[PDB]
Amino acid sequence: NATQINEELYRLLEDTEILNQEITEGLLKGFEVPDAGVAIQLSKRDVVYPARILIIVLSEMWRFGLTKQSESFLAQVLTTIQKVVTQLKGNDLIPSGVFWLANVRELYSFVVFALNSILTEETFKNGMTDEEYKEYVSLVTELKDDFEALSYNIYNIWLKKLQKQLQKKAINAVVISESLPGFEYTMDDILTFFNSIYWCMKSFHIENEVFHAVVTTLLNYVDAICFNELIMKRNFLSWKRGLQLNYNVTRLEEWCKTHGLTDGTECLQHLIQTAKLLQVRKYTIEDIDILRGICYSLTPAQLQKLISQYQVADYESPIPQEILRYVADIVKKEAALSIFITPETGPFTDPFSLIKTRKFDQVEAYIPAWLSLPSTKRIVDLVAQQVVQD
């Protein structure tokens, strides 16, 4: 009967000490992301199952007016998720983070959907007193704000971790790696990293703006650190080196062009222009005047630095002292009128906050076969029975 189901449901829902353990250990900390691989497409069902489970439990708590229970429940949910994202490392960094980014997004979008309802439809005032409704509204509101905070947090944390993972590979792959014959990580490693980001976000049904934001940030970061590596290289900067650098950066550019990013070049401006300098002639004063127009993103001090560390090749005529003089004279000129590019460290704006929330027409009751959650499964199954009856 219905009252039986409601009874056992109540008994299960007020039992916070078991539900919290099960949720925070088996579902959150014991999360298993599809180890199949990032390139492999999934149904949303297999991506946001924890959030949907949490949504069913929460909505059923709110059904029986268990506000305090929901408070503790969601406090531990938020804290646990942020902690889980904070502790990520290794080969699981990309797939796991995105996973949680999906789930948080699934949770937020629901909380939002709840608030609106509570405010819009009068029916939700029927079974509760004025001040219970008041504290209810207060709860859901503050919860919305807290989930904004959580989304922001795990996004920035994950992105910073990504920057950390790029740090090592990118400098060796872009500055030191030599692809072309006749002129350890390579460009294939970088390209593989970005391939993994792209495919992961694609398969976990993540919105594109987030992808654009992440890759833009990471690329600006690479441009910055690699420029900061180049402008310090002393017995390194040459025409051949310029050629190979140009080739590598070109590979990144092609990756951007082929993966839907229009503003890649703009994100790689400093490396592109440093590559352009090292190749164009720097013998005539005319050549330097043209060089000023080509490197429209480089300060005269940086130009002077790059030029003053140009390593000449066999039988190659050195950069004229008249030219070094002229350049130092333009630097002198515009000094009156630092050389390193400081990399943006974050925190950045959450891209999820710049798009519409996910609509919530329906919630699918589904608890993955391999999952071990007795109480939660009992709750979801009871609710499912109740829906089957109606």
Which residues of this chain interact with another protein, rule CB under 8 A? 6-7, 10, 55-56, 58-60, 62-65, 71, 74-75, 78, 82, 86, 89, 110, 113-114, 117, 123-124, 126-128, 142-143, 146, 149-150, 152-153, 156-157, 160-161, 164, 345-347, 360-366, 383-384, 387-388
- Residue-wise over 316-341: b if at least 16 C-beta within 10 A, else e? eeebeeebbeebeeebeeeeeeeeeb
For residue 106, the minimal CB distance to another protein (Å) is 12
Nearer to another protein, 77 or 288 (CB): 77
Nearer to another protein, 160 or 377 (CB): 160
For residue 87, the minimal CB distance to another protein (Å) is 8
* Whole-angstrom distance, CA of residue 187 vs CA of residue 235: 22
> For residue 371, what is the DSSP state?
-
Nearer to another protein, 160 or 212 (CB): 160
- Find the DSSP H helices in 204-317: 208-230, 239-258, 264-267, 269-277, 285-294, 300-308
For residue 336, the minimal CB distance to another protein (Å) is 34
Q: Give yes or no for a contact between 175 and 224, defined as CB atoms under 8 angstroms apart.
A: no
Q: Give yes or no for a contact between 158 and 88, defined as CB atoms under 8 angstroms apart.
A: yes
Which residues, at least 6 apart from 123, have a Cβ–Cβ distance to it below 8 Å?
none
Nearer to another protein, 3 or 317 (CB): 3
Nearer to another protein, 15 or 287 (CB): 15
For residue 223, the minimal CB distance to another protein (Å) is 19
Nearer to another protein, 88 or 327 (CB): 88
For residue 136, the minimal CB distance to another protein (Å) is 10
* Whole-angstrom distance, CA of residue 233 vs CA of residue 38: 37
For residue 113, the minimal CB distance to another protein (Å) is 8
Q: Give yes or no for a contact between 174 and 249, defined as CB atoms under 8 angstroms apart.
A: yes
* Whole-angstrom distance, CA of residue 325 vs CA of residue 235: 21
